Amino acid sequence: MKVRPSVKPICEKCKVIRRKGKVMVICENPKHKQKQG
Amino acid sequence: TKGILGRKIGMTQVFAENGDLIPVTVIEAAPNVVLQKKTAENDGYEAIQLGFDDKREKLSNKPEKGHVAKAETAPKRFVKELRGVEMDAYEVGQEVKVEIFSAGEIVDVTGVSKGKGFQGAIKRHGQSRGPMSHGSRYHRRPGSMGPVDPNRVFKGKLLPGRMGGEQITVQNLEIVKVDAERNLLLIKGNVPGAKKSLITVKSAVK
Amino acid sequence: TPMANASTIERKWLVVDAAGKTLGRLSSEVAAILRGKHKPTYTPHVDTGDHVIIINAEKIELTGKKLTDKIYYRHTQHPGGLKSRTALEMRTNYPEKMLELAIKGMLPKGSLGRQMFKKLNVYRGSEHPHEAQKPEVYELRG
Amino acid sequence: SRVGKKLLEIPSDVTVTLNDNNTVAVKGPKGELTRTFHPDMEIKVEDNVLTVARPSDQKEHRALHGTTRSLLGNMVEGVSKGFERGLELVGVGYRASKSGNKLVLNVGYSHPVEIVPEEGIEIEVPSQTKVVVKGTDKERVGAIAANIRAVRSPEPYKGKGIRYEGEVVRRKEGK
RNA sequence: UUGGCACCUCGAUGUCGGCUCAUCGCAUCCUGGGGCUGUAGUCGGUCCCAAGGGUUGGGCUGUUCGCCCAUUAAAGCGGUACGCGAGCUGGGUUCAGAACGUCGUGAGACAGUUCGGUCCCUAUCCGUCGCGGGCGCAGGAAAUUUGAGAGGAGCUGUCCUUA
RNA sequence: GGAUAAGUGCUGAAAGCAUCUAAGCAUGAAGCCCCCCUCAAGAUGAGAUUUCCCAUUCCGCAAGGAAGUAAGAUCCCUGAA
């Protein structure tokens, strides 16, 4: 993961979603995988 | 689950098909007897009593006499209570003996530790002492009682008191030998308590 | 110069079901009647209340994520002797005590508060051993 | 553009029953199913065709209205045709077998691995490597498939381990 | 932490370090569980959850700290009056002696140095650890017990096989 | 063992797709509750079970009181595990 408050998409395929009230980022590229905390 | 209770005698050495010594503890368990057979319908749990003695009538009392006279036996001195066993097996007036066990069954044993008396922090709690030289006026003492802020002393701070007399169990022992003719158990090792004292033996709680 | 009661009391026995109820809004009434504020013959120092029975304590309700997030803390007088129990497992294992805690909290404090707590008698399920007292039902105003 | 708004035919060899308020039960050749649904919803089976409705338009009712139809479509598709998932696996000593109904795996460990489809699902081993889960509920089928895949999930360097047939494995360069 | 302000304390709140005694936080040193990797493996880096337990012995220095030797799974960071002197020591700082350098006309002085230099108190209350007595528990007694609830314990390596 | 953290997910819409999530399901830690050991009914909420004793005498209108006892225990004595 990349835990950080400044959560963004990186590439166009990065897809922001929300989960358990938290913000997260999805992509096939796991390095683009993010979460707030 | 199983169990028996008798009296400790002492310790000695025993060989095992080898030169291999065994430090042994010796117990006599004259045939114990059932006295009462409890139930969840009335007693809230399933369990039995066991008596180990043959007292004098000059020592016993009427209620004891009745409580045993349910069975066809005499008053008893060491009566205790086993739990979590097979109940349909047992009955009242039923004697239990050492040939329950065998020479390889593991065991948890239980007794009452020796009385050491009002002893200090070191012997009781294994603390370290202060230096005996270099100007020290401090040794054999417990230590500080705590910090300053809470204006008090926390619980659990360890201090002198009557060391001993505690109910102690020892797990995963191993039976070595049986002499049902002498009503004797020979157990690998050492147990809590002094000679002539009660010892309740149990199938090990694995 | 009004009356101030003393040994001129008639303590009835009430019964309360809790099949869908919020314990707070329920308890805020049961404690009031345990104190006797539902009576004209109220005095603050006499325990004019009325005995209470509660049934189906397990079957209470809550709002929000309390079952997961509401925490009953409790400290011993030992260091690090803090302990915690969620409302959920309290409800499962023993809802008697969590009802008792709420009601005790909203009762007055002192000997009289304790003695009016002693009238309370909470029971899981719908059994009610206290048939002999010939109680009656009390619906909740709330 | 909406899911729950649509309708679901009921071809044949099927029987739907509102046993109560919402506890639907379905039957057919592959077997049967049941589900309980949210009661604010409204369900009405007409001749050969099923309709769904919600009272309102909220974030809740909308989502439920979609999920109910999609789930019921899954149910009937399973009772008619059943659901199936394949699983490949890639190695050298990697293989499978069965001990009766159970599944057995010789992949990469000092020990083998055992799996039990207890729940009226069956498993098929047409080859030493390839595997099929086969049942009626997508939920349980995918669950078991993931239980399998978690055993020896693949690796990126050499694509190893259990692997859904339609999987796109990520790759690395072993330095 | 260095500090700033002077709010309690100058009809006295004893001040560094060390010993004994521990205790708490977690921003985790190890152990546990995971994500990502410029992760081949073995080892690692980084991040996340986790404070249950554990977290060495010596040389030098009064020392803290630090360097060094050898180990360890690891040799954690901090708070508790930089925890704890009515529990200990008193080596240093910080009285009176004397001396060196330096300053001063001089008496003398120096976060400059060096040698040596009195650590009192029968525990009333609370608190803590143990032990007894009294009464209560709708009659009086002997035994066995339930368990609310409390406390304890809770660490880890190396080797063989898999290979 | 049970429930969980981070994590992993299955099914799945809102948002015709995708989605571990809102509904609903499952996993998942030396950690939490248990399992292990000890204390424990002053738990004034004072519990439970078995067994023993009997329901005597005086006043006192009753209330109640004392005054000998049963079962039993102690004082006292020999001693220590």
Curated annotation (Swiss-Prot), chain A:
Pfam family membership, one: Ribosomal_L36
Subunit structure, as described in the record: Part of the 50S ribosomal subunit.
Entry's Gene Ontology cellular component terms: cytoplasm; ribonucleoprotein complex; ribosome
PROSITE patterns attached to this UniProt entry: RIBOSOMAL_L36
The protein, known as: Large ribosomal subunit protein bL36
PANTHER family in UniProt: 50S RIBOSOMAL PROTEIN L36, CHLOROPLASTIC, LARGE RIBOSOMAL SUBUNIT PROTEIN BL36C
NCBIfam families named in the record: rpmJ_bact
GO annotation terms (biological process): translation
Signal peptide: none
Keywords: Ribonucleoprotein, Ribosomal protein
Lineage: Bacteria, Bacillati, Bacillota, Bacilli, Bacillales
Curated annotation (Swiss-Prot), chain B:
Keywords: Ribonucleoprotein, Ribosomal protein, RNA-binding, rRNA processing, rRNA-binding
One Pfam family matching this protein: Ribosomal_L3
Highest taxon of source: Bacteria
Key word Plastid present: no
Region ranges (Disordered): 121-151
Biological-process GO terms, alphabetical: positive regulation of rRNA processing; rRNA processing; translation
Annotated GO CC locations: cytosolic large ribosomal subunit
Family according to the record: Belongs to the universal ribosomal protein uL3 family.
NCBIfam families per record: L3_bact
Function: One of the primary rRNA binding proteins, it binds directly near the 3'-end of the 23S rRNA, where it nucleates assembly of the 50S subunit. Strongly stimulates 23S rRNA precursor processing by mini-ribonuclease 3 (MrnC); 20-30% DMSO can replace L3, suggesting the protein may alter rRNA conformation.
UniProt-recorded name of the protein: Large ribosomal subunit protein uL3
Organism: Bacillus subtilis (strain 168)
Swiss-Prot record, chain C:
Cellular compartments per GO CC: cytosolic large ribosomal subunit; ribosome
SUPFAM superfamilies: Ribosomal protein L13
This protein's UniProt keywords: Ribonucleoprotein, Ribosomal protein
InterPro entries: Ribosomal_uL13, Ribosomal_uL13_bac-type, Ribosomal_uL13_CS, Ribosomal_uL13_sf
Pfam name, any one: Ribosomal_L13
Keyword Ribonucleoprotein (UniProt): yes
UniProt GO BP: negative regulation of translation; translation
GO molecular function, one term: structural constituent of ribosome
UniProt cross-references to PANTHER family, sorted A to Z: LARGE RIBOSOMAL SUBUNIT PROTEIN UL13M, RIBOSOMAL PROTEIN L13
Function of the molecule: This protein is one of the early assembly proteins of the 50S ribosomal subunit, although it is not seen to bind rRNA by itself. It is important during the early stages of 50S assembly.
Similarity comment: Belongs to the universal ribosomal protein uL13 family.
Subunit structure: Part of the 50S ribosomal subunit. Binds to Obg (AC P20964).
Protein name (database record): Large ribosomal subunit protein uL13
Source organism of the structure: Bacillus subtilis (strain 168)
Name of the coding gene: rplM
Curated annotation (Swiss-Prot), chain D:
Keywords recorded for this protein, A-Z: Ribonucleoprotein, Ribosomal protein, RNA-binding, rRNA-binding
Disulfide bonds: none
PROSITE patterns reported in the protein's UniProt record: RIBOSOMAL_L6_1
Signal peptide (from-to): none
Pfam family, one: Ribosomal_L6
Cellular component GO terms held in the UniProt record: cytosolic large ribosomal subunit
InterPro entries for this protein: Ribosomal_uL6-like, Ribosomal_uL6-like_a/b-dom_sf, Ribosomal_uL6_a/b-dom, Ribosomal_uL6_bac-type, Ribosomal_uL6_CS
GO BP terms, alphabetized: cytoplasmic translation
Gene3D superfamilies in UniProt: Ribosomal protein L6, alpha-beta domain
Key word RNA-binding present: yes
A GO term, aspect molecular function: rRNA binding
Stated family: Belongs to the universal ribosomal protein uL6 family.
HAMAP family tied to this protein: Ribosomal_uL6_B (MF_01365_B)
Biological function: This protein binds to the 23S rRNA, and is important in its secondary structure. It is located near the subunit interface in the base of the L7/L12 stalk, and near the tRNA binding site of the peptidyltransferase center.
Subunit composition and interactions: Part of the 50S ribosomal subunit.
Protein name according to UniProt: Large ribosomal subunit protein uL6
Organism taxonomic ancestry: Bacteria, Bacillati, Bacillota, Bacilli, Bacillales
